[PDB]
Enzyme design. Structure first.
Site, PDB file in Angstrom:
ATOM      1  N   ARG A   1      48.639  76.002   6.288  1.00  0.00           N
ATOM      2  CA  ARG A   1      47.511  75.075   6.330  1.00  0.00           C
ATOM      3  C   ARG A   1      47.748  73.863   5.437  1.00  0.00           C
ATOM      4  O   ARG A   1      46.798  73.262   4.939  1.00  0.00           O
ATOM      5  CB  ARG A   1      46.222  75.784   5.911  1.00  0.00           C
TER       6      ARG A   1
ATOM      7  N   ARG B   1      47.593  66.169  -3.944  1.00  0.00           N
ATOM      8  CA  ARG B   1      47.558  66.020  -5.389  1.00  0.00           C
ATOM      9  C   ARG B   1      48.410  67.127  -6.009  1.00  0.00           C
ATOM     10  O   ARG B   1      49.136  66.899  -6.977  1.00  0.00           O
ATOM     11  CB  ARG B   1      46.115  66.123  -5.890  1.00  0.00           C
TER      12      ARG B   1
ATOM     13  N   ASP C   1      33.361  59.655 -11.062  1.00  0.00           N
ATOM     14  CA  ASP C   1      32.192  58.829 -10.792  1.00  0.00           C
ATOM     15  C   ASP C   1      30.934  59.477 -11.354  1.00  0.00           C
ATOM     16  O   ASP C   1      30.922  60.672 -11.651  1.00  0.00           O
ATOM     17  CB  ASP C   1      32.046  58.608  -9.283  1.00  0.00           C
TER      18      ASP C   1
ATOM     19  N   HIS D   1      46.558  83.373   4.647  1.00  0.00           N
ATOM     20  CA  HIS D   1      46.587  82.002   4.138  1.00  0.00           C
ATOM     21  C   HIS D   1      47.763  81.702   3.220  1.00  0.00           C
ATOM     22  O   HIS D   1      47.851  80.609   2.652  1.00  0.00           O
ATOM     23  CB  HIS D   1      45.281  81.705   3.387  1.00  0.00           C
TER      24      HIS D   1
HETATM   25  O1  LIG Z   1      37.960  87.064  10.615  1.00  0.00           O
HETATM   26  C1  LIG Z   1      37.646  85.983  10.120  1.00  0.00           C
HETATM   27  N1  LIG Z   1      36.683  85.921   9.103  1.00  0.00           N
HETATM   28  C2  LIG Z   1      36.333  84.676   8.567  1.00  0.00           C
HETATM   29  N2  LIG Z   1      36.908  83.574   9.018  1.00  0.00           N
HETATM   30  C3  LIG Z   1      37.836  83.599   9.987  1.00  0.00           C
HETATM   31  C4  LIG Z   1      38.228  84.801  10.563  1.00  0.00           C
HETATM   32  N3  LIG Z   1      39.158  84.522  11.472  1.00  0.00           N
HETATM   33  C5  LIG Z   1      39.348  83.206  11.469  1.00  0.00           C
HETATM   34  N4  LIG Z   1      38.550  82.637  10.569  1.00  0.00           N
HETATM   35  C6  LIG Z   1      38.526  81.187  10.258  1.00  0.00           C
HETATM   36  C7  LIG Z   1      37.404  80.793   9.290  1.00  0.00           C
HETATM   37  C8  LIG Z   1      38.115  79.818   8.352  1.00  0.00           C
HETATM   38  O2  LIG Z   1      38.164  78.510   8.926  1.00  0.00           O
HETATM   39  C9  LIG Z   1      39.507  80.446   8.279  1.00  0.00           C
HETATM   40  C10 LIG Z   1      39.548  81.716   7.424  1.00  0.00           C
HETATM   41  O3  LIG Z   1      40.816  82.353   7.591  1.00  0.00           O
HETATM   42  O4  LIG Z   1      39.767  80.780   9.653  1.00  0.00           O
END
Ligand SMILES: O=c1[nH]cnc2c1ncn2[C@H]1C[C@H](O)[C@@H](CO)O1
Ligand SMILES: O=c1[nH]cnc2c1ncn2[C@H]1C[C@H](O)[C@@H](CO)O1
Ligand SMILES: O=c1[nH]cnc2c1ncn2[C@H]1C[C@H](O)[C@@H](CO)O1
Ligand SMILES: O=c1[nH]cnc2c1ncn2[C@H]1C[C@H](O)[C@@H](CO)O1
Ligand SMILES: O=c1[nH]cnc2c1ncn2[C@H]1C[C@H](O)[C@@H](CO)O1
Ligand SMILES: O=c1[nH]cnc2c1ncn2[C@H]1C[C@H](O)[C@@H](CO)O1
Lengths: 230, 230, 230, 230, 230, 230
Positions: E43, E24, E204, E4
């Protein structure tokens, strides 16, 4: 009268002995009762009513598990106005000092079921056997002079339990044996202001590997004699 | 010897009567025991040891609540090798058929505490009083011919309970009274292969508004006589 | 006035210091207060009220465990109109960087008790100490120049904890110490729009084995001075 | 071979249809199977094995409740090497748009039981029916052109449910009906890498009061035809 | 570097301000930071790093909800070696004495999430803000002389909460406001021996219906000044 | 119109495809939709609406985690009158037989979140995907002849899961993959009488270490074609 009982109010005695095996309840009715009459066979449950030493008494199967015995017990107290239900049957020894063929009288039963938490606002309900029934069962055991162990039982929802450590935890706390209905039975009796109890013959030990008729027949004598006392 | 007991192994009798109020335990030691000796006063807990009808016996306070009595009970069984602990005290009636001044003998105790779920893998532990102690207490009650009600007790963590509906739910299931220790005491005794029991005098009713010495003294007679029987 | 307090409204100061040991509360009243008067001794709880630097202040025991301090705290805020309660006492170090004799000021307290889940619809209630009291305690510590660690505390229901892994889990999350009341005290103060705080002297470490008066007297100075500030 | 089955490996077909009522399983074996042979009657469970359109198939009762069907299902997959289990039976409508006599195919089942939380580290296990079985059941329904509703089922531990609000909550979330086994069956099949499904005929509605053979016979046609497809 | 975050160790300052809205965070970086550089936009999270009064500082979005901020916070402390994370944003007032546009500084946060129970052996973890950050935020508020309320926050998993009674229960216990991340943030900081805090402007009120820039800009001044102090 | 959507009723199509990454939703709108128009960008969520094969369709990000997608999904069904929501995205393989780049269609999703227990009176809600959407997704997969695995998904609250044993437990029960929204999405659709489904491309395996565009583009084809079918 009910979705699980074709009998009508009055067909059942005020005292009913119940075991899981329907074929066992039939055997019991044919072996210990005089003039047994089939009063309910919905789902092959084998519900009979005859007399023991002149007094009315019924025997009926209750299937395996709390959910099952809960249906039957509540219908019996509620609709058929039954007063006392004594669960008679087999169980699995936990405590190292308990051996196969031993007879156990439950003072109460613990459980991994969620039923009681549902009926008791998510708190700890002590599924306790009616003191009257425990005493009647123990006096009968004393009068007949049949060795019996009195203590905690455990009603599991999982005959094949994934939590393999539980067995040892229960041995440490000295739970006597394991079955699958007591914890459900006891609270229902409380709710209806009625009575419930349990007596079982250990058919096997779960912590190690270890004529079985004598034990069973002895248990029946106790249950039957205790029924008369109540 | 322990963080809460200055006494040494042997200073306590194998049978100990415990009440929440330390001043009450002192009163009991001065009123019913012969040659009472203060064996532990850590935290003003008033731990005494004297004799009743020639037999050794100790009386000590246990504070209010499961956490408190859990500390004392476990130390007593574990370190001071105590065998029997009988909780003597007051409680609040729940059942409409139970009245202030009535004496109640717990077969078991339910609870809203999390302690037992912690010791029992998050399942339902039936905090059950030792059958030996229940019988001794009931026989004593019968021999002394003192009316006593036997049944379920409830050990609350909240004297001032936010869940106001619980009281009625408990009345429906016929819980006799409410105190704050039994549910903690019973399982600890099981773990140590020892015995525990409870007898209380209803000091008030929680569902409605309703000489108090006679009731208390009668309860003491039962507890004391039962101690001798054990 | 209440089942656990014989005093009447006005007998208690608006600020009350509480410790588990009743004999300690008596010692505190005789050592740090001027003209201390016993205002409540129900259950030997040793409730005193005197003055510190001319201002009214009360000291009283609260027994061990959340259930116990819950009874006293709620009665104090509700009936005796107390405004601030500062728990003073001992605790057991958890964090490897915390040592015996260290003084700890709780920002909040975690717990294995079910009480808060009961009061908070089964969710996570953050038993937080009143920011005013935390600040007063910390300023007092700074003004007196007494080293004190500020952070999370843990209120256990089990002094003798079966879950032996918990200690290490808590060290990993850096919980400072363990006692048995804070988690119960803080929420009650919130409910009554009052204030609560906690300061303790580590009497021992639970993860390893490690003059104790100085530490205790220093803690008292902080609590007393902070009381004046509030 | 097992405590609840006298049959030996090979006596059961790889596909077994199960209903709660043992007398119903017998009726099914006598009505839809050719050359049915009783392979297991321990506890009067009525376990039969015959053939449908030349293919081997077994029918057996499973008692009422998750604990019960859990014993049978696990023994079948594990010991008798069964591959597919299709629960056939009755249920109670919840959704206002579902009516008595309607046929329902469960995509999955919710539950108030604790079993799955026990097997799944206290988390939310989605008791889901095997997609292969759901498809086979739906295709059979389409090919036979028999109207059937596909959706969520609910396996209750309490036929007589104390939580009277649950019914409406379930209607809001559109649960189709209620029975007492699916939630237990589905996860066990997953564990053994096998398949499980469920199809039921609504015998009554729980939210209001509302030829029953046609519905049942139609459901059987679907289950039987789907068995051949698998 | 992470799933991420495209940035590398060193691209982030040791202190990071985070808000839910990525747009923001961009606005904040363009308005309050000098020479802001986009260090991570995986993202569209808008991760920037610039300087405030000569000191390095980063701002980045964290999405809505505990699960989201948990991913970012843990990656920041663990991989990018961040030391302090201050959540800046909006919240919904609960307490009747809190009004729209008020600024709130969380001492801690309660939650209906299960995350902390998972990390803390199913017990009550007090999601507490780091005392250093609470003090820095409050001193900044005092030095800038900007009225701010300090107290409990609540991190909900359900913006649209089905449990409509919770709002009032929280008002009774005096929770200041509601957001969706604090309860997740605080424990993660504890685990990494780092710091976390939260300051929000009430956008709010949830219990009734009640220029918004001034409030927001004032909150930013406090957060920024507090960042320099840390 | 809502706190998280600036669009007005009618701006969204009755079918909306959602992924966690907002930049991905933008890419999807620019790559697969004709005449895409940004209808909502509150919080940079990238909400677009265009047409696929002449039919209206919207794509929008939903952030990571159940709490996040819960806000968006409920607003979409409730305010913008959306009928079908198909979550499209990535996930982490669990099952040893599932490999990176595989496409998975969820029949349902398990979770360690508390959300569903909150909406379902603390019982087991089976977060099930709408049978219509599962079928449309599978038919599309069959018609396009793209290999896809159908089965259980798991929506975790903890991307970085402390409970390291869970992964293996899930492999044993054959959960296909892990994401963070499905379990929240499905029940909300049920409540509004609408539809929801999920299809993901495995971006990595969590139990071991193992062109990625083809997989993603194939998944999109399935989702898009299935949208037309609904
Ligand atoms: O391996 C994973 N574990 C939890 N979430 C996952 C995994 N691979 C993709 N995802 C999805 C869940 C969330 O939307 C985001 C987390 O990286 O992408
Ligand atoms: O060892 C046992 N575990 C669980 N239940 C037992 C055991 N022994 C006998 N039973 C009883 C409980 C059910 O009624 C049935 C399970 O075989 O018989
Ligand atoms: O009514 C009661 N509720 C809870 N506890 C009670 C009650 N009556 C007596 N007790 C006992 C429990 C504690 O030991 C103490 C509380 O007043 O005295
Ligand atoms: O180490 C401890 N664990 C639990 N409680 C402690 C510890 N040290 C002091 N205390 C406090 C809590 C109770 O008030 C009493 C228990 O000994 O004293
Ligand atoms: O309405 C019902 N509630 C619960 N179980 C039901 C209902 N209708 C049929 N059943 C099934 C579940 C058990 O197998 C048995 C209970 O009567 O039959
Ligand atoms: O009133 C609120 N309830 C829940 N979350 C709120 C509220 N006001 C602001 N927030 C925050 C939490 C999330 O980050 C987002 C939800 O709108 O903004």
């Amino acid at each position: 009268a009910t979705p699980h009982n074709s009998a009508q109010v009055g067909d059942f005695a005020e005292t009913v002995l119940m075991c899981g095996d329907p074929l066992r309840a039939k055997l019991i009715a044919e072996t210990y009762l005089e003039n047994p009459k089939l009063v309910n066979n919905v789902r092959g449950i084998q519900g009979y009513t005859g007399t023991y030493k002149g007094k009315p008494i019924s025997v009926m199967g209750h299937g395996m598990g709390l959910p099952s015995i809960c249906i039957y017990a509540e219908e019996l107290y509620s609709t058929y106005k039954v007063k006392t239900i004594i669960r008679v049957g087999t169980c699995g020894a936990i405590d190292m000092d308990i051996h196969t063929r031993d007879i156990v009288i439950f003072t109460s039963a613990g459980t991994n079921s969620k039923i009681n938490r549902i009926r008791f606002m998510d708190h700890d309900y002590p599924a306790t056997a009616s003191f009257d029934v425990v005493c009647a069962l123990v006096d009968a055991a004393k009068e007949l002079n049949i060795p019996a162990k009195v203590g905690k039982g455990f009603s599991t929802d999982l005959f094949y339990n994934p939590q393999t450590e539980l067995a040892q935890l229960m041995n440490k706390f000295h739970f006597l044996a394991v079955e699958m209905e007591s914890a459900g039975l006891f609270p229902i009796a409380d709710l209806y202001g009625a009575r419930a109890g349990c007596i079982c013959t250990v058919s096997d030990h779960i912590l190690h590997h270890e004529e079985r008729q004598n034990s069973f027949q002895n248990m029946m004598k106790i249950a039957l004699e205790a029924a008369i006392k109540l």
